[PDB]
Amino acid sequence: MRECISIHVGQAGVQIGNACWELYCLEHGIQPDGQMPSDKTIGGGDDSFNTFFSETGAGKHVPRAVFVDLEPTVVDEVRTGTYRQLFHPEQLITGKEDAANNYARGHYTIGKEIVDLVLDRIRKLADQCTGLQGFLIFHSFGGGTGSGFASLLMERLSVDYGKKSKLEFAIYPAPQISTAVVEPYNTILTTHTTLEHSDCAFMVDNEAIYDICRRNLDIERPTYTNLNRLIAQIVSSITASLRFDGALNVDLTEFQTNLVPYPRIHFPLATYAPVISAEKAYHEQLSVAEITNACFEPANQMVKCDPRHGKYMACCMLYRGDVVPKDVNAAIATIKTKRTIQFVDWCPTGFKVGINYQPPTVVPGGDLAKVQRAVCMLSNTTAIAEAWARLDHKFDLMYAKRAFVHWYVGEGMEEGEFSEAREDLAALEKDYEEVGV
Amino acid sequence: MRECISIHVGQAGVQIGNACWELYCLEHGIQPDGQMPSDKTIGGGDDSFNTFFSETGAGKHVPRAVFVDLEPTVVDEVRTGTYRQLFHPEQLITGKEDAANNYARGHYTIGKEIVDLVLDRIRKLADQCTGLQGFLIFHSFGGGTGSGFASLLMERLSVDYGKKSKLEFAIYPAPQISTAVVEPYNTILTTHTTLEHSDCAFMVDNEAIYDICRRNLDIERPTYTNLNRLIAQIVSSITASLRFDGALNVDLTEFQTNLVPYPRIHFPLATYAPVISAEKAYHEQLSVAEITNACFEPANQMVKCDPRHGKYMACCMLYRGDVVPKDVNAAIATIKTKRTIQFVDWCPTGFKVGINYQPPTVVPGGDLAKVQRAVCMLSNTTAIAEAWARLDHKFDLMYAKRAFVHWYVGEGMEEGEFSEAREDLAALEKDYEEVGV
Amino acid sequence: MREIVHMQAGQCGNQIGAKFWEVISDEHGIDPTGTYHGDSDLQLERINVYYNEATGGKYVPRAVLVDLEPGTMDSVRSGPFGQIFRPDNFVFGQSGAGNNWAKGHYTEGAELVDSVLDVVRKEAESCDCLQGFQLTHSLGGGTGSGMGTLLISKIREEYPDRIMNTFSVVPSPKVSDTVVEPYNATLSVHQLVENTDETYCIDNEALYDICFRTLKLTTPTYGDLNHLVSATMSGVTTCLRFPGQLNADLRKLAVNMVPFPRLHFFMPGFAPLTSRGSQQYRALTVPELTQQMFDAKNMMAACDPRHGRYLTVAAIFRGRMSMKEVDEQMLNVQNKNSSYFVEWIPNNVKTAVCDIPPRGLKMSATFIGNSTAIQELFKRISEQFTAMFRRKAFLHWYTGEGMDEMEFTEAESNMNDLVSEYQQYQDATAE
Amino acid sequence: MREIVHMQAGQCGNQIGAKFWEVISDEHGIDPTGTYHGDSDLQLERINVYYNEATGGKYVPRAVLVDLEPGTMDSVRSGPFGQIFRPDNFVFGQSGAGNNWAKGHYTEGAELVDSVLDVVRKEAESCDCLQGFQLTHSLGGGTGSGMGTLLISKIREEYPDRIMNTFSVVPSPKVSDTVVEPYNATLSVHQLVENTDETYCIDNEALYDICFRTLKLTTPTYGDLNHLVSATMSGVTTCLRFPGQLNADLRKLAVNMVPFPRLHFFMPGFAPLTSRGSQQYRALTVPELTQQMFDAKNMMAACDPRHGRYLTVAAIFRGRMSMKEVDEQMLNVQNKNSSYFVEWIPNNVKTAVCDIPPRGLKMSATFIGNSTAIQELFKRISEQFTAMFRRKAFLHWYTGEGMDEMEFTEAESNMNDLVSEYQQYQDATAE
Amino acid sequence: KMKEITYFNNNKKSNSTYDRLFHVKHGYQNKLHRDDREHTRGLKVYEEESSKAVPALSSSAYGHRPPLEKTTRKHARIEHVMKGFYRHRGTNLPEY
Amino acid sequence: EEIHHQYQGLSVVTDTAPKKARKERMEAEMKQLERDIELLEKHKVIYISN
Amino acid sequence: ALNSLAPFATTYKPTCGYFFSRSTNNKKKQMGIPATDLV
Ligand SMILES: Nc1nc2c(ncn2[C@@H]2O[C@H](COP(=O)(O)OP(=O)(O)OP(=O)(O)O)[C@@H](O)[C@H]2O)c(=O)[nH]1
Ligand SMILES: Nc1nc2c(ncn2[C@@H]2O[C@H](COP(=O)(O)OP(=O)(O)OP(=O)(O)O)[C@@H](O)[C@H]2O)c(=O)[nH]1
Ligand SMILES: Nc1nc2c(ncn2[C@@H]2O[C@H](COP(=O)(O)OP(=O)(O)O)[C@@H](O)[C@H]2O)c(=O)[nH]1
Ligand SMILES: Nc1nc2c(ncn2[C@@H]2O[C@H](COP(=O)(O)OP(=O)(O)O)[C@@H](O)[C@H]2O)c(=O)[nH]1
Ligand SMILES: [Mg+2]
Ligand SMILES: [Mg+2]
């Protein structure tokens, strides 16, 4: 009944969803061909998967994701690989020619001649839905399909569906490391659109996940596979309260009305704990107090910023496993009485806890250990202004010599959009300063 | 016992009937030699085959088909094909030469030599029926036997029988894809005569159903065979109420008293759209509500004119198969709440539902996946004036130089027919405009 | 049951018809003796269209061999598939008169016209429906031009309802190849225009260009040229002979192609023509067939279609193919070369798919098109005609066989009127 | 699906393209005959990027070999892997331009260009995506330079929205290898820097250097040089053909490596390169690949990059690897040699990882770089051009065959404008 | 021989030019949009990349391993109100 | 296949008399072979008379 | 078959080109039929 539409835009979004649907199928028991090994005899009502999958007739569950991309490649091995049958053949919408790291090309060209088909697929999915409440736009801020077309689809979904919780999961460029050279341009241009259309946009870079894999996980060779599996674990811990019962169940409405103080500060940070490996998991007493401490550690943040320089407004604990609310109260009391973890003055009550009974599900061939306790700590801090200042400095370095502007200009997007996006993020930074003081 | 007699005139009509009688024999369990096996009968004296096949008593059944073409070909393919012993040799009538894309040859010179013979065969096959539902004419407006001789047959049938239902199925020329150059002349000459004699003209063009086969049935190199099977499925779903029972049944007067507001507004459009292939039907739950609102989009109407540019006037929705009479009304209520389509103000109630119990029958050799639900929606709509405007523009644009006129002139027809057909189509367009406003 | 009577007159017409009765004999399974040595049953349904049955299973062609001389009659009789013709349908004289339209039309060519007309009459009453007559001749000769158009006029007078077409080997723009060719061509088209309604203009250096820049073929010869002509012979009547998805006979591709009566000069073509070397390197698909059609490097008339606009176009396909692919290809080429088409008629292309291909080919094709680019040939012939007629050169061999300058002036006026109306209907705008 | 049409011009183009179509067809599994003796359907999924496959298993390429004299075409057809090419797309002239830009651009090279564009249009409309155009011409010759740049101008004029990549061999700093080479190269680059979206600038001292003292090889023949060119030529378009991790198409590389439109001259690099004796002493890992990339010796354009700064760098890794390896190595290069990088561009390195390495390599590395050190090539060529033009060197051919002195003047104008743009964007600071 | 990816194919039959050209097949399949572009559906990698012990694609690593856990069925949101209070057929009202 | 492989390796133009004759001899030989094995492949029995 | 179309053979008497051999006799053959003679 509690539907939720997942929309994977760009190569990063498609690969994140490729990990995510593997995790969802392993969690809910649906085999890669779409056929549950059991049927309606056992399992009782068997309505846990209805957030993502939809059983069709004989018993084949088809998910509620749209894999849309302008280049053919990655969605073709999605269509060809292990999950070829599980996805609907017209859900996996391909493009004709890649946007190729260009917001202008993703928003003023061939993105138009894919958007009607993807919108009609979205309407078909939502009319199949019977109580749809939220969207799961997974994409990247690197540029191209994941920025321009994702912004276009966000604008059209906002003007079509009206009020709807549109959760966004964005891949942010790290401070020292990024791939393309037009990532600053693409981030400023996509933030100008997603500032007023998204609702609780979660932000993740690659460097922090690499550091967590090297420190906690003992992975000397981390890669995009481990990155996307960790992000899949994050989103599974976010949406687990919809599908499994617990002491306190948290859905998207009370998620976003607790994590959004003002209708511009909607960029929280996601930290998972523990992200331990099995060897270090053997030598430990993994429990509520120390996983809250690991959540509030500055070394386990999944955005490359220092939360100790932050001014924490409101955070939600998402407990997953056999977690005792008394232990929750004790851990939150210790975190609140710690003094380096600084809260803002106008929100003393900034600890929204929600406990789910279902323990986390490990992926075979994975890296995370089996744990009886997990927290998806989601915090609306003020340390993201460091990221905004960094990317604004990168945009200024790009924009001083007007390098890489002629591609956008000859495509058709003008100088006014660059100026509007820069002044929009300047106003956003002054909004963080005004709310932080 | 509720017999209806089918006259297939022209090459398009003969090929369409060649698919239609294949589908009819498969539905009623009739082998191509003409006999029903003893283990493929309903038993207890079933009567759900006499609407299309009589019974010359030996165990053999012969159809009520009046296959007629002025050329020796295609009917010879019917005579030498696998459906050879099914038809009587006198039911398959051939002439000296084809009318060869000429309304004048089809209506005045060649057809006069064979019109008495085909009228005699129609008289015999009508007298053999205890009760006649009406006539099912199958032809093409492209030109030749299917245009001029079809008009001559309709004039003679209106003279002889009168007041009987005469459904015609006309292969209309598409706007951009077409075969002959005198197709506008042939359509303009036919629609002057079929206006005063028919009472329901189901018109289909080739480009729209090419798009249907490419998009929904994922055959992006289809052929006239596949078009004929889909048109056969449409006519089987419309005649499935003189046979196998169920809920509300709609017969030859039932879907005509509620489809024409005014007498010369008998030009509706058909849409059969659970057209889902085998690999795409397994990954979908084919439900009544979604097929119901799928049979309302411009991408699924099989006439190249969008229904948005025009107000709806009447809709007769013919379900088929396992359909509960609740979710039909629920889906129609949702469509009434939809603001995309627009009904006319003088028709508040504008939906007529027929429902059967027989599931659709699959032909071995077509894609046409096994579905338990079907809709054969027929809408009388003011958006059909776009095709009239297009072909009138083509007609005047060709007639400015008086090209291809001497072929009609030197055969038994004069230019006053061209002028009066121009005036009649101008009056028809004006009447559609006045009824729509 | 439609019916064609073949009439080969002149040297060129005799050789072309010999290769045509060669190329359709093995298509219908006929051996040189006359029996049916074949496999498919589809060749004995409309075999009556070209061959009538005879004593003891023998099929003989419904063809009339017409000449003022022996020679290539000896050649046709001696060559392979030559002892298949009935030895009575062999009307030939003994003068050796040639390259004189006067001697072929108002002289001894009018002596044998009664005999050949009685032969053709017996051929025609040997039929039951008689769709039409198909004549092969050369524009620019004596026997095939004069006697040919005389027979055209007599057949048009005696059966003024049936479809009758000529395959009209036209004179050559490059070089001359016969000195009195403009006179012969002028006087022949002056009779062809009012009588015929389907003239397939076939030119010689166009065929040389096809055989050399398309099939390599360093030794081209008249065998290859006549096989090129015979391919587009068979491609027009393949719909009559064999079943198809959308049939179209000669009357249909006449009415679909003639907007006004003096607008019936077509430009035939064939596809797929490929070399021996570039055969494994080529994919035999419908878009390749369509682009090889509408490329100007396939026309059998030496006039170039880029300087004019096509009036109407036919693409008779043979083989098993996809209807949507075929008519989508014609839509694509029309919308691409929309400037190379007249805009005062919409959808000026015609499809006719036959379900039987020729031997050894998956698919084949036949492009025949009424275009306004054919006026360049008539302008050249009229200019050569008035260049010779302004100084009365070679005119006494025509006036000594019973003519006058009034006929030459009438023919020149007809040429100028036909060229002027081609100009009018190529520059006539929509509105 | 992103087809790119491949083109060879001149003897340099013909030989480089012949070895390229050896290498990439060995990568995709095509035998000498043309069929598929491959290993996986991964090589077949995107095999139509380079090959217009026929019916069955024929896999001929979309390569146009063009020249003014047949020559090297007969050499290619006689050579190994030469029968794969289609006999239709061997258009050529008859005389031979040689090393005359006027003979390649205005004289009989300029009458072949109609047929050349005819073949280019045929191969372009026998597609559905048409990503771009590869040309492997010679910069500093005749038919390589003049006809190549004329073809680039025509193709950019008639399809002005496509990726245009030309590879080109650079005029040599040492030796000469051609006496009129500065004139030819200046006239080629004058028409080159308006239309080509990317030029790759391969150089014939670096090819000898990195096989003489990096690959040892004693006498290093010429096939090894052509193989070494074709290695990075294949490695650039790995994202268009093989799947894997984070990709970079041709347009992605163009938008990542071109900050301003007249800055699109890059330098190539292939960096698995171990000597034959010391192959087993090296540990082939991404840090070793990155060390071999960011090294002054390995660049195949001369232009010792310690004499300037890289504007942009792109690196295409090919193999089963980690992303943290490649991304951390690029971080290390940037943060270490930030002094030799452009300071006003943070993150001036694009990375692209495919997981299909070529034959004989577990791992592979392809370098490409827009540097502010490639102006030494253009500075030397402008200096040599001014040295010859002051004393009026070989010029009467050009002037009496159809050039003017003014054309040489705007050629030198674009020369010194381009080197001024490189110097001005090198010496500028961040603020 | 061993090459970068193993795939011990049995020489994948022969493709002789005479049989490829002059054995004419009138057997086009309508599932494609053009006859030449044949290798857009008949792609066979989905079982050989699973027969890999370690696969040749980074993207084909998501679900290569067999499942390990029992999915922990005990905590599931079993619907009892709006799926248990509604019973499909039968007004109570006995009819015997 | 052997004569086809030899014929495919000819020059781009055959302008001399031996080149023109060597093209045509191989073309005639290969098409005579084509007729021979077309007659062989079209049939299944093949009896030999004397 | 002697008149193939796809590998284009239009088989005639061995004249011209390579196969000219001062043979394949070019003397005309006897017609047999005398003439058309009503006189
Ligand atoms: N976490 C994670 N990030 C990825 C992955 N793949 C790509 N990315 C991110 O994507 C960025 C590059 O931009 P893309 O997302 O590939 O661009 P796109 O959305 O595909 O649009 P185009 O550039 O037009 O192809 C890199 O900086 C990566 O951080 C992945 O598998 N996991
Ligand atoms: N859907 C469909 N349409 C056909 C078929 N056959 C012919 N047509 C249509 O018919 C038009 C051509 O006119 P025909 O029907 O062939 O001619 P005719 O009505 O038989 O009259 P004649 O000229 O004497 O042959 C084309 O434009 C087609 O749209 C068919 O098998 N299926
Ligand atoms: N294609 C072809 N054309 C021929 C042949 N013989 C003659 N011609 C053409 O016929 C024209 C001369 O006409 P001709 O045969 O002398 O007419 P006739 O004197 O009435 O028989 C020339 O332009 C030739 O091109 C032949 O065998 N094949
Ligand atoms: N790789 C390669 N380079 C060549 C070849 N021939 C010439 N070059 C280079 O191209 C330049 C001269 O090219 P040139 O031979 O005049 O090309 P052309 O215009 O086709 O004749 C010289 O600087 C050479 O370094 C070749 O066969 N292979
Ligand atoms: Mg991408
Ligand atoms: Mg017909």
Description:
Chain F: This is Enkurin domain-containing protein. The structure is cut from a larger assembly and holds 2 copies of chain A (437 residues), 2 copies of chain C (431 residues), 1 copy of chain E (96 residues), 1 copy of chain F (50 residues) and 1 copy of chain G (39 residues). Chain A has 437 residues and is an alpha/beta fold. Chain A has 15 helices and 11 strands. In chain A, helix 12 (325-337) links the parallel strand 9 (314-321) and strand 10. In chain A, helix 13 packs antiparallel against helix 15. Chain A is globular and about 60 Å long. The N and C termini of chain A lie far apart (43 Å). The longest helix of chain E is centred in the first third of the chain and has 5 residues, at 17-21. Chain E has helices at residues 17-21, 48-51. Chain F is 64% helix and 0% strand. Chain G has 39 residues and is largely without helices or strands. Chain G has no helices and no strands. Chain G is flat, with a radius of gyration of 17 Å. The complex binds guanosine-5'-triphosphate (2 copies), guanosine-5'-diphosphate (2 copies) and magnesium ion (MG) (2 copies).
List keywords for this structure.
part of a larger assembly; 7 chains; A: 437 residues; alpha/beta; five-stranded parallel β-sheet; four-stranded mixed β-sheet; 42% helix; globular; E: 96 residues; little secondary structure; 0% strand; flat; binds guanosine-5'-triphosphate; binds guanosine-5'-diphosphate; binds magnesium ion
